Amino acid sequence: FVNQHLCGSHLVEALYLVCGERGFFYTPKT
Amino acid sequence: FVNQHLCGSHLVEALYLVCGERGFFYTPKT
Amino acid sequence: FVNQHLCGSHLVEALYLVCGERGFFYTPKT
Amino acid sequence: FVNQHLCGSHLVEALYLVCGERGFFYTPKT
Amino acid sequence: GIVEQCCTSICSLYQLENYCN
Amino acid sequence: GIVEQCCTSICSLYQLENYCN
Amino acid sequence: GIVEQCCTSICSLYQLENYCN
Amino acid sequence: GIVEQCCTSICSLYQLENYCN
Ligand SMILES: [Cl-]
Ligand SMILES: [Cl-]
Ligand SMILES: [Cl-]
Ligand SMILES: [Cl-]
Ligand code: NA
Ligand code: NA
Ligand SMILES: [Zn+2]
Ligand SMILES: [Zn+2]
Ligand SMILES: [Zn+2]
Ligand SMILES: [Zn+2]
């Protein structure tokens, strides 16, 4: 995997690349 | 004509900003 | 994203003097 | 280890590389 | 739908909150 | 949530393979 | 509880008082 | 108290490990 400290459009967009057609939830909240 | 795959990676833009702190839900199925 | 690991030092740097006789109370978890 | 007198700001910066993700406090009073 | 309107048509940043987390 | 794991530190595919449906 | 704001934002000799010992 | 042990004289990584929560 591209192993990095991802943030911004660097992250959640990448899910849809791997997370598939199921869906996802975004918790910005630490 | 209808590329959700692109709509999904573009919208995914507008999903994060508007809901960057409240976050968001998505299901690519739907 | 922002690095507090670095960023904090400048800060953990500042807690001491400005604090004086009292000193500070930190927690590197939250 | 490095061992010397440890006073002023120089020390407050020591518990940062030694204390970890746990947390800390600072008491200036000897 | 969400995949019907925002795609063949554009969406305005306000209605976008309809489908938020 | 995810940030402590992935933005503050690096997250691998299967570490977030848990974040989806 | 300050480490998340006083990082990307600016606080000096007057706002951080809130979190000092 | 905290300083006299490490500042006046020398202090060691473990003698210092007690100054953490
Ligand atoms: Cl595109
Ligand atoms: Cl960046
Ligand atoms: Cl820096
Ligand atoms: Cl000196
Ligand atoms: Na982009
Ligand atoms: Na220095
Ligand atoms: Zn960037
Ligand atoms: Zn695009
Ligand atoms: Zn720095
Ligand atoms: Zn000096």
Whether chains F and A touch (3+ CB pairs under 8 A) is answered by: yes
Q: Do the chains contact at H7 and D7, CB–CB below 8 Å?
A: yes
Contacts of E2 in chain B (CB under 8 A): 30
- Give Dmax over CA atoms of chain E in angstroms: 23
- Long-range Cβ contact pairs of E10-19 (< 8 A, separation 24 or more): E11/B11, E11/B14, E13/B14, E13/B18, E16/B14, E16/B15, E16/B18, E17/B18, E17/B19, E19/B15, E19/B24, E19/B25
User: In this complex, does chain G touch chain C, defined as having at least 3 beta-carbon pairs under 8 Å apart?
Assistant: yes
Segments forming the whole domain that contains residue D11? 1-30
- F8/G5 Cα distance (integer angstroms): 15
| DSSP structure class, residue G13 | S
Could you give the CA distance from residue C11 to residue C28 in angstroms, rounded to a whole number? Answer: 12
Q: Of E1, E13, E21, which is closest to B24 when you measure between CB atoms? A: E21
* φ and ψ of C26, to 5 deg: -105, 165
Q: What are phi and psi of D2, to 5 degrees?
A: -95, 130
Q: Among all chains, which residue has been given the structure tokens 């930190």? A: C26
Cβ E20–B25 below 8 Å, yes or no? yes
Indicate the number of domains in chain C.
Answer: 1
Shortest CA gap G16–chain D (Å): 15
- Quote the tokens at residue A11: 């992250």
